[PDB]
Amino acid sequence: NFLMKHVFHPKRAVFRHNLEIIKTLVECWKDCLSIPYRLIFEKFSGKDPNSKDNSVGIQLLGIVMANDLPPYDPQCGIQSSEYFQALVNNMSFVRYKEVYAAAAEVLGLILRYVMERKNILEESLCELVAKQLKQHQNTMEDKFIVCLNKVTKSFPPLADRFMNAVFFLLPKFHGVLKTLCLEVVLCRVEGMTELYFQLKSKDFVQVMRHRDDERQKVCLDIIYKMMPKLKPVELRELLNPVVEFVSHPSTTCREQMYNILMWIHDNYRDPESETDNDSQEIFKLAKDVLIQGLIDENPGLQ
């Protein structure tokens, strides 16, 4: 109890060392150690914006969250369920960071914990969505999608309530925000019917052709996941930017392209009669570029 009240220090190295020794204390002595959830609540219950006072509280909650502990409010009468709101409220405070991104991350783990062990399921989710929704229309589109990406790193299903807005925000974004949008839409691709129409409606090939070697990898993963349930007509158009990834400086993009190639070749092999000329053209391009892959520079994927 005493070792977590005096951890806020000017230098960041001392704060990190204190957090490390607190984490080591909890994991080694997990049994026969009650957790003072009131102290953490008092730490992250700040009201003044741009103050950087709830960061220590959310960091303590993340530290206790990493060793399979109850996700705050163990229903021991120490606090009430309305103090679980002060944890989501933390995502509103803008500027200085470390107060909304970490809050979104810890909230995602807590939801995941509650979706895995039954008990309460969606009660946290509604407020978190409202916070995302409020941060959506009232300008501030840059913060909304990064908070959504932080949440969806542990809880994909919440993205199901914002896919339309995610696709609407895609053309106007730039830099890393476009990448965040792309992995947000990547975290939910299975069961998303008519995904190709939405992707093509926002000029997906121009996003793929731009050299980013991380965004390109994300788009390649999206294509590899979306490849089943796709007609050969769609794959005929989609294959040319994929096979343009030969001689790409990045090894990982070439490897993902090669994996796409291996899937198409077994799947399109010996097609039943002349069902579609696209099914024939698609097989020929993949087979020939797969042959071309035999002299690749990287000795591993070769």
Curated annotation (Swiss-Prot):
This is DNA-dependent protein kinase catalytic subunit. The modification N6-acetyllysine is found at K43. Belongs to the PI3/PI4-kinase family. DNA-PK is a heterotrimer of PRKDC and the Ku dimer (composed of XRCC6/Ku70 and XRCC5/Ku86). Formation of this complex may be promoted by interaction with ILF3. Component of the core long-range non-homologous end joining (NHEJ) complex (also named DNA-PK complex) composed of PRKDC, LIG4, XRCC4, XRCC6/Ku70, XRCC5/Ku86 and NHEJ1/XLF. Additional component of the NHEJ complex includes PAXX. Following autophosphorylation, PRKDC dissociates from DNA. Interacts with DNA-PKcs-interacting protein (KIP) with the region upstream the kinase domain. It comes from Homo sapiens. Serine/threonine-protein kinase that acts as a molecular sensor for DNA damage. Involved in DNA non-homologous end joining (NHEJ) required for double-strand break (DSB) repair and V(D)J recombination. Must be bound to DNA to express its catalytic properties. Promotes processing of hairpin DNA structures in V(D)J recombination by activation of the hairpin endonuclease artemis (DCLRE1C). Recruited by XRCC5 and XRCC6 to DNA ends and is required to (1) protect and align broken ends of DNA, thereby preventing their degradation, (2) and sequester the DSB for repair by NHEJ. Autophosphorylated at two clusters, the T2609 cluster and the S2056 cluster. Autophosphorylation induces a conformational change that leads to remodeling of the DNA-PK complex, requisite for efficient end processing and DNA repair. It is linked to Immunodeficiency 26 with or without neurologic abnormalities: A form of severe combined immunodeficiency characterized by reduced or absent T and B cells, recurrent candidiasis, and lower respiratory tract infections. Some patients show dysmorphic features, severe growth failure, microcephaly, seizures, and impaired neurological functions. It is found in: Nucleus; Nucleus, Nucleolus; Cytoplasm, Cytosol.
